[PDB]
Structures are given as structure tokens and as C-alpha cells.
Design a protein around this nucleic acid. Structure first.
Lengths: 335, 306
RNA sequence: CUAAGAAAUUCACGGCGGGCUUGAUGUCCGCGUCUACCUGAUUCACUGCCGUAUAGGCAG
């Protein structure tokens, strides 16, 4: 009957490291191994109430009384030095093999059928499109996020590390490569071939990704913010806390992974957003809305179940979406 | 349970986000069960192909860093979390708190078999290194040291030296390699001795109170502090049986249907962090599995230490 | 076969108004630092000549 597995899990393929942030001057990007790190500092901010009022605080006397109480906060801030205009973001990326193999799965017939489905996908077209989109997300500085917004020029340098040295080196102009269009380029095709060979291999392929963004002299950079629950303590806390590994501002690994996963342009809604991160039930945290709802037949679980159990193979784009979810991983399976 | 013919020093491994939730009652460094399971996975993946056996692990913790913060006005600590993806209805999911930490460790793997004579030591050490370079140690990825000043090579040393002086020099140089760190050992005998001392101090005292007393900072009036022999962390010592051993197909929603499943619960023991110079041989730091499936007691420990 | 497997914290912010720290003061008596050494190991790979020569020889 080929019942679906009660416990299903997939290992996270294509896992990056923390994006270390460092600062320097442009046209010295080559000798950037000794660039000083960007440090997270402390500063005091005094604001004023600017949020919406609930029709009972709109009395002028209460508003003036609440303004007369100073609103003080302590925030973590990261800045470029007052003589450095370039932010260097460096992280390491492992492209693991055994991409379609589940990490944990109950039913052995479901094992054979799922591995047969992945084998059909890989010998039909393989990871050609998926690794193309991942290499595009590497080539443009999507992992900088807000650091990519107002940069004069962004250059991404990607090096293949085989044993201890650069086997093959890439250099891209991130602002020329779009954040929503996946064209074809020769160096991009070479990077896609390397990533696809890493996904189809039995070991791993190591890449280091170094992006230089010309933010501005002494401007304010944006490391990943840390999620800390207040938990109803009586003392006032610092409102903003930035992430750092060793006295050096950094971006979270899952933030970089979410940036790399932004390849899904096949969701049923219109591509006004463009690509979105590959997730089950197509959730977008910034938009607060989950595309690929299960009421439509385009969510990951129903597509996978139709593909592997009832042999209802979806469209090629939906097959790419399902295999991209397999790359992403996750804990699956009903009770 | 056995004497290794050689020691395999996995070099400084940068572990990114390790599970800082070691046990239901302890936090911080990951459980030794994670390291023993990682070594067993190394044996299951590459150890069989090399005709060797990888049993025993030495944990040194060259660097530790947990993603924690201390709220203002509180002396305790909280764990920094991650923003999970939204639900299918666009709302924030319920937060499940997990602790994630940064490690830098080097592992001493006990090697015994015929592949040591069948293959060169550098070759098997290397192949184990690039096998471990695509794995996980405590739920976190392993950073493989690309484009730094110089990577640390893997080094396998046979314990059967040509002489006692040569063996002693090799042990001291291997200790010098993993110097900025602290070896992790288990202190079950010390915990029992302290429990007997506590029982002579006052009766009906359980070993949980002895374990708590050996880790807390005690203040005594004339105001002094009761000194501790070492670092004396509380560590999970294994798993104890909580249910009769079920057949592989009895338990619904198991990991597989080929392995028996038994419900367990954590066993908490005593551990110590100490400098590697204070051990007679580096093979005394190796952590081994001790299952004994008849009575439960699915334990990991480091025997032959003292 | 690792309390296994999975994860975007994030948008915005004026901390400043002002101020006499001054009064007085003994550091101090005493003291054995000795003894004994190869800097030098080829430690000046130097000056000139024949030859276009960095190729290669020769002179004290």
C-alpha cells in the first residue's frame, strides 16, 4: 500500500558557517587577510513615543505627560571605522553529498521508493537548475541582506578549497547579478557544476565566500540580531543585541542559509516578491504570509506524497522545489 | 574495555553550533555520549573500510563559547534562540528553547586492528580527517580550516614504541600538541567516596545531594569557601532503563523497524576538567561505551583513569 | 549511527541643564655584596689578473 513514513528526517545539505564581518579600504581587498574585525559597541539612544495610540491615549494631556517622561534605551551598534569604507564578509560553505538520502526513515519500502524517485530526478536533469540558483545566490550578495542595500559596489570572491589551497577561484560583481533573475554565465555555470558535483558526490565540497561591500566611510553595518526573550523581568533590558563570535560582529549561519535558499520562484502566487526561501508551506517571515498553502496542491508534503506514493510526478519546477526542500532538510512524518 | 594499539589525534576541530543542552539538569559542554557516538559513526563510515576499529575518545576543549546572555537584574542566564519559519497560517510558531554553542576540540581516537599494519599511519589518519570533515559532533557543523595561516595535520602515533623513553617522549609531544585545553574525565569513584563521607556526616543522603554538593560553591562560617580538588562538573553518565525492551516492530513512530526500542532516562554522574599533563598516559582519557542491556545501564564512561 | 534530524529577531530613536572639594603636616635612625674566568671557534669567502662572459680558470 506504500504507507508514508511515520518518522522522516533529512540532513541539512549546503550548510554555511557564521559570516565574519571585518573592515578595510577599497582597492586593498587583495591584502585583506589582516583586516581588523568589526566590533559590536554600546551606545545610548533617547527616543520619543511614535507608535499608534489606542484611542484612549490620544488625549493631549496624557500624550504630553508621556512625552515628558524620557524614553531611554541601550542598543548594540556596529560601525565601520572612520577611515575604512569597505565591509568584508567571509564565511565557509560545505556542499554535502548524499543529497536525496534521508537521515531517518521508518519504512524500508518507502526508503526504496524515495531513493528511486531521487534517482529518477538526478538522472533526468540532476541538480543543474538547483545548483545554478544556489551559485546565483552565492554570486550576488544576498547573504549581506541590509548590508547589500546601499553599497556603492559589491564584489564576491569564491574560492574552492580542495586540500588546503585554492583549487579554483571565482570573482563576481554582485550588483550586476540580479536578486530575482537567474541568467546563465560561464563562471556561474562552472560554480553550478562544482556545487552539483558536491551535491551528487559522496563526500563534500568546501567553498569560502568573501564579499566586499563599499558601504561608505565609517557607516553603520548590520550583523544578525540575537533573539532573546524578555520573559517578563522587572528590570529594563537592552533593546538591541548584535551577534558576535570572538569580539567580531557576525551573521548567523541560518541567516546565510536562508539567503542561499531564496531560489523558489515556482510558488502559485505571483512573483512580485521574486524568489523566496525554500520551506515547507512556503512561509515568508518578512511577509507574514505562507504561500503554497495545503488547500492548493503545491505544498511540499502533498507534492512529495503524490510523487513517491501515487507516482503522480509533478511539474519539473515543482520537482525542483521538492528536491530543494530535500537539500534544506527538516523533521517530517505524521504520528 | 580494550587497550588501543595506537592513538589517533584528530586536530583542532572548530564546531559551530553544538547542543549546549547536555542533560535535563545540566548545561554547557556537550555530553560525552555525543563524542562517543561521533567516534562510533566514524568507525561505521570509514573505520570498517580501513579494517580498523575506532573506540575511545579524548576530549580536550581548546575553546568553548555558548550563545548565552545574562538579563539585567538577574544572576542566572538565558539561551539565545533562533527565529524559526512561520506556520502555514502565517503566525509565529511556539518557541522550543535549545542551547547552541561554539567549540574547538581535538580528539584522541583509540585505534586497534590490522589496518594499522595494512596501511600507512598518515594515510589512515588523513582519510579519517576528511571523513570527519563532513560530519557533526554535537548537533553542529565542523569548520574545516580553509585559507588560514596553516592547517593542523592529523597525526597517528603507535603506542608500541621502540623503547620506554621513546614512548614517553611521544606521549609528552602529543600532550604538547593539545596543550591549550583541559582533558575531560569521569569521577564515579570520587562521587561515591563523597557520598559515603556525606552519609557519615548525616544519614539518608542520596547521591544526588552529593553530586550537588561537589559542584555548588559552599560557604562555611568561621567566612571561608570549601575548596574543591578540581573543576568537578556534573555530567550525564548514560541512560538507565525505564521500560521493558520492546521488539523492533512494537513501538509506533520509531526511528526504524529493525532495532529494539527501550524508553530510558538520564543518569547523572561526576566529571572533571584537568590539564593533559596530569595523566600518566593519553589513552587513559578515552571514553568508552558500556551498554549491559540486561539491566539497562546504557552508560558511557572513561575507565582505567586512576 | 552524536537529547539524532530542522530554523531570518527586526523595523525606528536628541540624554542634558548647573556646580569652588578645600584647611594643616619632620619619614627615620643603622648597614662589608663578595669570590673565580681564553670570546673564538679556519668568523676577513678577501685583493688583483686571463677571458665579452654572470661560462670557466689564474696570481699572493
Amino acid at each position: 500500500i506504500l504507507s508514508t513514513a511515520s518518522v522522516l528526517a533529512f540532513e541539512r545539505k549546503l550548510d554555511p558557517s557564521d559570516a565574519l564581518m571585518s573592515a578595510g579600504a577599497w582597492a586593498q581587498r587583495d591584502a585583506s587577510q589582516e583586516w581588523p574585525a568589526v566590533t559590536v559597541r554600546e551606545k545610548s539612544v533617547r527616543g520619543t513615543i511614535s507608535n499608534r495610540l489606542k484611542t484612549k491615549d490620544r488625549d493631549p494631556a496624557k500624550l504630553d505627560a508621556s512625552i515628558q517622561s524620557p524614553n531611554l534605551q541601550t542598543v548594540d551598534v556596529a560601525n565601520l571605522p572612520s577611515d575604512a569604507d569597505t565591509l568584508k564578509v567571509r564565511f565557509t560553505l560545505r556542499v554535502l553529498g548524499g543529497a536525496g538520502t534521508p537521515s531517518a526513515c521508518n519504512d524500508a519500502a518507502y526508503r526504496d521508493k524515495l531513493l528511486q524517485t531521487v534517482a529518477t530526478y538526478v538522472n533526468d536533469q540532476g541538480f543543474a537548475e538547483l545548483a545554478r540558483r544556489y551559485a546565483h545566490n552565492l554570486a550576488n550578495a544576498r547573504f549581506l541582506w541590509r548590508n547589500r542595500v546601499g553599497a556603492e559596489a559589491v564584489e564576491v570572491r569564491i574560492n574552492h578549497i580542495r586540500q588546503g589551497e585554492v583549487a579554483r577561484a571565482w570573482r563576481f560583481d554582485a550588483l550586476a547579478i540580479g536578486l530575482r533573475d537567474f541568467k546563465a554565465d560561464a563562471e556561474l555555470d562552472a560554480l553550478a557544476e562544482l556545487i552539483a558535483s558536491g551535491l551528487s558526490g559522496s563526500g563534500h565540497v568546501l567553498l569560502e565566500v568573501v564579499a566586499f561591500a563599499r558601504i561608505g566611510d565609517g557607516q553603520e553595518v548590520f550583523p544578525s540580531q540575537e533573539l532573546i526573550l524578555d520573559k517578563g523581568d522587572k528590570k529594563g533590558q537592552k533593546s538591541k543585541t548584535l551577534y558576535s563570535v570572538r569580539d567580531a560582529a557576525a551573521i548567523h549561519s541560518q541567516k546565510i542559509g536562508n539567503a542561499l535558499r531564496t531560489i523558489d520562484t515556482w510558488y502559485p502566487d505571483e512573483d512580485g516578491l521574486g524568489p523566496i526561501a525554500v520551506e515547507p508551506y512556503g512561509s515568508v517571515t518578512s511577509q507574514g504570509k505562507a504561500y503554497r498553502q495545503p488547500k492548493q496542491k503545491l505544498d511540499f508534503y502533498t507534492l512529495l506524497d503524490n510523487w513517491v506514493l501515487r507516482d503522480e510526478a509533478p511539474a519539473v519546477e515543482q520537482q525542483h522545489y521538492v528536491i530543494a526542500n530535500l537539500i534544506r532538510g527538516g523533521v517530517f512524518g505524521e504520528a | 574495555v580494550t587497550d588501543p594499539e595506537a592513538l589517533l589525534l584528530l586536530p583542532r576541530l572548530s564546531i559551530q553550533n553544538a547542543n549546549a543542552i547536555s542533560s535535563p539538569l545540566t548545561w554547557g559542554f556537550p555530553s560525552p555520549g555525543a563524542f562517543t557516538g561521533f567516534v562510533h559513526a566514524l568507525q561505521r563510515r570509514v573505520g570498517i573500510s580501513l579494517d580498523i576499529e575506532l573506540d575511545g575518545v579524548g576530549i580536550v576543549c581548546h575553546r568553548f563559547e555558548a550563545q548565552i546572555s545574562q538579563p539585567a537584574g538577574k544572576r542566572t542566564k538565558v539561551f539565545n534562540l533562533t527565529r524559526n519559519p512561520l506556520n502555514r497560517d502565517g503566525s509565529t510558531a511556539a518557541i522550543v528553547e535549545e542551547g547552541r554553542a561554539h567549540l574547538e576540540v581535538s580528539l584522541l581516537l583509540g585505534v586497534h586492528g590490522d589496518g594499522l599494519d595494512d596501511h600507512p599511519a598518515q594515510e589512515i589518519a588523513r582519510q579519517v580527517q576528511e571523513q570527519a570533515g563532513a560530519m557533526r559532533l554535537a548537533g553542529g557543523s565542523i569548520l574545516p580550516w580553509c585559507n588560514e595561516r596553516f592547517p593542523a595535520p592529523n597525526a597517528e602515533l603507535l603506542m608500541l614504541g621502540g623503547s620506554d623513553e621513546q614512548r614517553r617522549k611521544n606521549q609528552r609531544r602529543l600532550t604538547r600538541r593539545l596543550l591549550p585545553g583541559f582533558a575531560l574525565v569521569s569521577r564515579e569513584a570520587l562521587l561515591q567516596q563523597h557520598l559515603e563521607t556525606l552519609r557519615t556526616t548525616l544519614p539518608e543522603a542520596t547521591t544526588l545531594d552529593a553530586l550537588l554538593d561537589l559542584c555548588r560553591i559552599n560557604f562555611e562560617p568561621p567566612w571561608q569557601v570549601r575548596d574543591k580538588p578540581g573543576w568537578l562538573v556534573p555530567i550525564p553518565a548514560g541512560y538507565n532503563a525505564l521500560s521493558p525492551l520492546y521488539l523492533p516492530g512494537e513501538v509506533r513512530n520509531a526511528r526504524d523497524r529493525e532495532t529494539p526500542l527501550r524508553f530510558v532516562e538520564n543518569l547523572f554522574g561526576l566529571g572533571e576538567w584537568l590539564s593533559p599533563h596530569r595523566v600518566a598516559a593519553l589513552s587513559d582519557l578515552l571514553w568508552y561505551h558500556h551498554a549491559e542491556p540486561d539491566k539497562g545501564l546504557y552508560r558511557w564512561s572513561t575507565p582505567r583513569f586512576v
